[PDB]
Design a protein around this motif. Sequence first.
Motif, mmCIF file in Angstrom:
data_model
loop_
_atom_site.group_PDB
_atom_site.id
_atom_site.type_symbol
_atom_site.label_atom_id
_atom_site.label_comp_id
_atom_site.label_asym_id
_atom_site.label_seq_id
_atom_site.Cartn_x
_atom_site.Cartn_y
_atom_site.Cartn_z
ATOM 1 N N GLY A 12 0.857 -1.177 0.000
ATOM 2 C CA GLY A 12 0.000 0.000 0.000
ATOM 3 C C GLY A 12 0.892 1.224 0.000
ATOM 4 O O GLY A 12 2.037 1.148 0.461
ATOM 5 N N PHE A 13 0.390 2.353 -0.491
ATOM 6 C CA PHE A 13 1.197 3.571 -0.560
ATOM 7 C C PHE A 13 0.583 4.736 0.157
ATOM 8 O O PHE A 13 -0.608 5.016 -0.044
ATOM 9 C CB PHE A 13 1.409 3.990 -2.035
ATOM 10 C CG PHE A 13 2.164 2.997 -2.883
ATOM 11 C CD1 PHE A 13 3.553 3.008 -2.924
ATOM 12 C CD2 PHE A 13 1.486 2.068 -3.667
ATOM 13 C CE1 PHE A 13 4.252 2.093 -3.721
ATOM 14 C CE2 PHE A 13 2.188 1.136 -4.449
ATOM 15 C CZ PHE A 13 3.564 1.156 -4.467
ATOM 16 N N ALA A 14 1.424 5.486 0.913
ATOM 17 C CA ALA A 14 1.024 6.765 1.532
ATOM 18 C C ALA A 14 1.725 7.806 0.671
ATOM 19 O O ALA A 14 2.946 7.774 0.558
ATOM 20 C CB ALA A 14 1.512 6.859 2.976
ATOM 21 N N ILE A 15 0.961 8.682 0.019
ATOM 22 C CA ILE A 15 1.498 9.700 -0.891
ATOM 23 C C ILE A 15 1.449 11.085 -0.238
ATOM 24 O O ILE A 15 0.423 11.452 0.329
ATOM 25 C CB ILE A 15 0.801 9.622 -2.292
ATOM 26 C CG1 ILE A 15 1.141 8.287 -2.981
ATOM 27 C CG2 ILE A 15 1.175 10.802 -3.212
ATOM 28 C CD1 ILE A 15 -0.031 7.594 -3.594
ATOM 29 N N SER A 16 2.555 11.848 -0.317
ATOM 30 C CA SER A 16 2.612 13.196 0.269
ATOM 31 C C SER A 16 1.618 14.173 -0.338
ATOM 32 O O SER A 16 1.315 14.101 -1.532
ATOM 33 C CB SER A 16 4.019 13.787 0.197
ATOM 34 O OG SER A 16 4.375 14.126 -1.137
ATOM 35 N N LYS A 17 1.097 15.074 0.501
ATOM 36 C CA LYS A 17 0.161 16.119 0.089
ATOM 37 C C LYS A 17 0.856 17.454 0.293
ATOM 38 O O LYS A 17 1.643 17.593 1.235
ATOM 39 C CB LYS A 17 -1.142 16.031 0.903
ATOM 40 C CG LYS A 17 -2.002 14.849 0.484
ATOM 41 C CD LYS A 17 -3.102 14.532 1.472
ATOM 42 C CE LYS A 17 -3.932 13.371 0.982
ATOM 43 N NZ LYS A 17 -4.918 12.929 1.998
ATOM 44 N N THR A 18 0.624 18.416 -0.623
ATOM 45 C CA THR A 18 1.240 19.743 -0.548
ATOM 46 C C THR A 18 0.563 20.582 0.529
ATOM 47 O O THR A 18 -0.670 20.625 0.584
ATOM 48 C CB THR A 18 1.212 20.441 -1.920
ATOM 49 O OG1 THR A 18 1.542 19.493 -2.939
ATOM 50 C CG2 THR A 18 2.168 21.634 -1.993
ATOM 51 N N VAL A 19 1.375 21.234 1.391
ATOM 52 C CA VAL A 19 0.900 22.113 2.473
ATOM 53 C C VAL A 19 1.650 23.446 2.440
ATOM 54 O O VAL A 19 2.880 23.465 2.378
ATOM 55 C CB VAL A 19 0.918 21.423 3.875
ATOM 56 C CG1 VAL A 19 0.759 22.428 5.020
ATOM 57 C CG2 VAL A 19 -0.158 20.339 3.969
ATOM 58 N N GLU A 20 0.892 24.555 2.450
ATOM 59 C CA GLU A 20 1.425 25.915 2.459
ATOM 60 C C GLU A 20 1.361 26.470 3.877
ATOM 61 O O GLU A 20 0.363 26.280 4.577
ATOM 62 C CB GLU A 20 0.637 26.838 1.504
ATOM 63 C CG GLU A 20 0.638 26.424 0.039
ATOM 64 C CD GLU A 20 1.985 26.386 -0.658
ATOM 65 O OE1 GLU A 20 2.629 27.453 -0.783
ATOM 66 O OE2 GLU A 20 2.380 25.287 -1.111
ATOM 67 N N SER A 21 2.435 27.149 4.294
ATOM 68 C CA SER A 21 2.570 27.791 5.604
ATOM 69 C C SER A 21 3.568 28.945 5.496
ATOM 70 O O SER A 21 4.088 29.204 4.411
ATOM 71 C CB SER A 21 3.031 26.780 6.654
ATOM 72 O OG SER A 21 4.290 26.213 6.328
ATOM 73 N N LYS A 22 3.817 29.649 6.612
ATOM 74 C CA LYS A 22 4.754 30.770 6.693
ATOM 75 C C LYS A 22 5.753 30.466 7.800
ATOM 76 O O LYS A 22 5.373 29.835 8.789
ATOM 77 C CB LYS A 22 4.010 32.085 7.020
ATOM 78 C CG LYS A 22 2.927 32.466 6.011
ATOM 79 C CD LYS A 22 3.104 33.880 5.486
ATOM 80 C CE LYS A 22 2.155 34.194 4.352
ATOM 81 N NZ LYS A 22 2.557 33.534 3.080
ATOM 82 N N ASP A 23 7.017 30.906 7.654
ATOM 83 C CA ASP A 23 8.018 30.697 8.709
ATOM 84 C C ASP A 23 7.902 31.793 9.796
ATOM 85 O O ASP A 23 6.981 32.614 9.740
ATOM 86 C CB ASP A 23 9.452 30.566 8.133
ATOM 87 C CG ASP A 23 10.054 31.795 7.462
ATOM 88 O OD1 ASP A 23 9.475 32.898 7.599
ATOM 89 O OD2 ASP A 23 11.122 31.662 6.835
ATOM 90 N N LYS A 24 8.834 31.809 10.770
ATOM 91 C CA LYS A 24 8.860 32.778 11.875
ATOM 92 C C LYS A 24 9.089 34.221 11.406
ATOM 93 O O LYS A 24 8.692 35.151 12.107
ATOM 94 C CB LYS A 24 9.888 32.370 12.949
ATOM 95 C CG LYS A 24 9.671 30.963 13.523
ATOM 96 C CD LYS A 24 8.907 30.951 14.855
ATOM 97 C CE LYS A 24 7.420 30.695 14.713
ATOM 98 N NZ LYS A 24 6.655 31.951 14.499
#
Length: 106
Positions: A12-24
């Motif tokens: 079975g495969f777990a595929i990465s999802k794109t996530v947007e955020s901001k640094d400090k």
Amino acid sequence: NWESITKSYYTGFAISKTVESKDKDGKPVRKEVITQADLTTACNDAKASAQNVFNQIKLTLSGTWPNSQFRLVTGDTCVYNGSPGEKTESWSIRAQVEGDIQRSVP
């Protein structure tokens, strides 16, 4: 009396999802995320794949051994090639389960 015919891995495969955020400092950062829940799903997929294969193989087994019963013994948990987390680039984790196709022996 159960005897193993063949034991192999089902995947079975777990595929990465794109996530947007901001640094400090407020700079936008792009991440590729795999969660623990994704690993569990990937392991359930591996188990369903083992069952799917068994369902086809059993069609031949009943001809090879018409006096036997057959079963699939699946590992309780998977072995993974990665841990949940975040990465710069898109990625995946493989969940492998052992699937042992067995027959009853008189």
